Amino acid sequence: RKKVVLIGTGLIGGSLALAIKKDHDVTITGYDIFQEQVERAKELHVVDEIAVDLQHACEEAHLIVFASPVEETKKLLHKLASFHLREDVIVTDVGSTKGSIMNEAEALFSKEISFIGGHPMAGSHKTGVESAKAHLFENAFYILTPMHHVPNEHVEELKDWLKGTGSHFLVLNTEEHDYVTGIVSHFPHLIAAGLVKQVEKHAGDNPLIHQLAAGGFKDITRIASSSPKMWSDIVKQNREHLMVLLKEWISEMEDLYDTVSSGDAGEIQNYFADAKEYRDSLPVRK
What does 72 bind: a copy of itself, ligand NAD, none (CB cut-off 5 to 8 Å by kind)? ligand NAD
Smallest separation (angstroms) from a copy of itself to the CB of 128: 15
The residue (of 45 and 214) whose beta carbon lies closer to a copy of itself is 214
Residue 33 interacts with, from a copy of itself, ligand NAD, none (CB under 5-8 Å by kind): ligand NAD
> How far are the Cα atoms of 268, 276, 278 from residue 281, in angstroms, in the given order?
20, 8, 5
Pick the binder of ligand NAD from 17, 46, 67, 192 (CB under 6 A).
67
Task: Put residue 122 in one of left, alpha, beta given phi > 0 → left and psi -120 to 50 → alpha.
Answer: beta
Give the separation between CA 134 and CA 178, rounded to whole angstroms: 26
- Residue nearer to ligand NAD on the CB measure, 111 or 229: 229
Q: How far is the CB of 211 from ligand NAD (least distance, A)?
A: 17
Candidates 5-13, 60-68, 104-112, 278-286 — which segment interacts with a copy of itself by CB under 8 A?
278-286
| Eight-state DSSP code of residue 123 | -
CA–CA separation, 273 and 203 (whole Å): 31
Residues, the chain: 286
Beta-strand pair 141-146/114-120: antiparallel
In the region spanning residues 25 to 64, those forming contacts with a copy of itself, defined by CB under 8 A, are none
Do 186 and 241 meet the contact criterion of CB atoms below 8 Å apart?
A: yes
Q: Is 249 in the site for a copy of itself (CB under 8 A)?
A: yes
Contact pattern from residue 121 through residue 150 relative to ligand NAD, giving x for each residue in contact according to CB under 6 A and a dash for the rest: --xx--xx----------------------
Contact set for ligand NAD, span 221-280 (CB under 6 A) = 227, 230
Determine if 182 is a binding residue for ligand NAD (CB under 6 A).
no
| Residue closer to ligand NAD, measured from CB, 66 or 109 | 66
Return the number of the residue (110 or 124) whose C-beta is nearest a copy of itself.
124
Residue 169 interacts with a copy of itself (CB under 8 A)? no
Report the residue number, 101 or 147, with the smaller CB distance to ligand NAD: 101
Binding residues for NAD(+): 11-12, 32, 68, 72, 96, 124, 128
Residues 6+ away with beta carbon under 8 Å from 199: 209, 213, 217
CA–CA separation, 221 and 164 (whole Å) = 30
What SS3 class is residue 148?
coil
- What sign results for the dihedral spanned by CA atoms 100, 71, 56, 143? negative
Q: How far is CA 284 from CA 28, 143, 170, in A?
A: 34, 19, 18
Q: Which residues bind ligand NAD (CB under 6 A)?
A: 7-13, 31-34, 37, 67-70, 72, 76, 94-96, 120, 123-124, 127-128, 227, 230
